[PDB]
């Protein structure tokens, strides 16, 4: 339950937040699934990121790293000045990157020239706030902005959680309202044409003229996923999710 002050962020929660905050720059790679207990996948993941930076197709990567006991840590990897690769890291419990032997071995193998920037800053004050701090760290470290100090962290923990969870709640409700409208418009189809979508909007017996004409307007080869995404950007679907409060 997102309203619970002790809610543990999931992988999807962090992905949704990082996409929301950073996603307008397509040169930032947002990595979803990486865990220290999966060494082969970790090395594959870091190598892909380093190859995308080498080629110039990506400038930076933000990586929510899953450690022991469902703990989350923040790693960012960017092109530095000159020809440097900069690895910035912060564990919200203040534990050194050096404690993470697997990760240090991986990095030494793939990029032994990398500049390691372990901020080593205790931030969390309970067993539940890794998620909020990893998100706030990844956003700031990505742009070479200073992360919250131990004192600011203590002062801001509930505020940064509340701001992030407000988005998560809105995101979930808008997406649920968009997916339900998408289901009524798709009927027995997995995919529809623009023409069939418009037919289905004109024929719909529940929407009103304003909502149907705001819809075609707000809209200015379509799947459940792409139509859901479209409907989620529409003002009147956002209105319905806002009432669901």
Numbering used by the authors: 6 to 225, 234 to 258
Paper text:
We cloned the N-terminal domain of OtDUB from genomic DNA of the O. tsutsugamushi Ikeda isolate and included residues past the putative DUB domain (1–311) to examine a potential accessory domain that could modulate DUB activity. We determined the crystal structure of the apo-enzyme at 2.0 Å resolution, which revealed that the Ulp1-like domain of OtDUB has the predicted core fold of cysteine endopeptidase (CE)-clan proteases. OtDUB lacks an N-terminal VR-1; instead, the C-terminal accessory domain (residues 170–259) protrudes into the VR-1 position via an extended α-helical arm positioned close to the catalytic site, suggesting that it assists in substrate binding. The C-terminal region of the protein fragment, residues 260–311, was apparently disordered and not observed in the structure. When compared to the phylogenetically closest structure, RickCE from Rickettsia bellii, we observed structural conservation of only one VR: the small loop in VR-3. Besides lacking the N-terminal VR-1 present in RickCE, VR-2 of OtDUB comprises a loop and two short α-helices, while RickCE VR-2 is a large helical arm largely absent in OtDUB. These large structural differences between the two DUBs, and other prokaryotic CE-clan structures, are obvious when aligned, yet the core protease fold is conserved (Cα root-mean-square deviation (RMSD) 1.2–3.9 Å). A substantial structural transition of the UBD was supported by the apo-DUB-UBD1–311 crystal structure, which lacked density for residues 224–235 at the beginning of the UBD, a region that includes the ubiquitin-interacting residues D226 and K230.
Here we report biochemical and structural data on the DUB domain of O. tsutsugamushi OTT_1962, hereafter called OtDUB. Primary sequence analysis revealed conservation of a DUB-like catalytic triad (His76, Asp96, Cys135) and Trp77, suggesting that the Ulp1-like domain is catalytically active and not an acetyltransferase, respectively. OtDUB preferentially cleaves ubiquitin chains having at least three ubiquitins and efficiently cleaves both K48- and K63-linked chains, unlike other members of this clan that prefer K63 chains. In summary, we have uncovered a unique DUB from the obligate intracellular pathogen O. tsutsugamushi that is capable of efficiently cleaving long ubiquitin chains of different linkages and binding ubiquitin with extraordinary affinity.
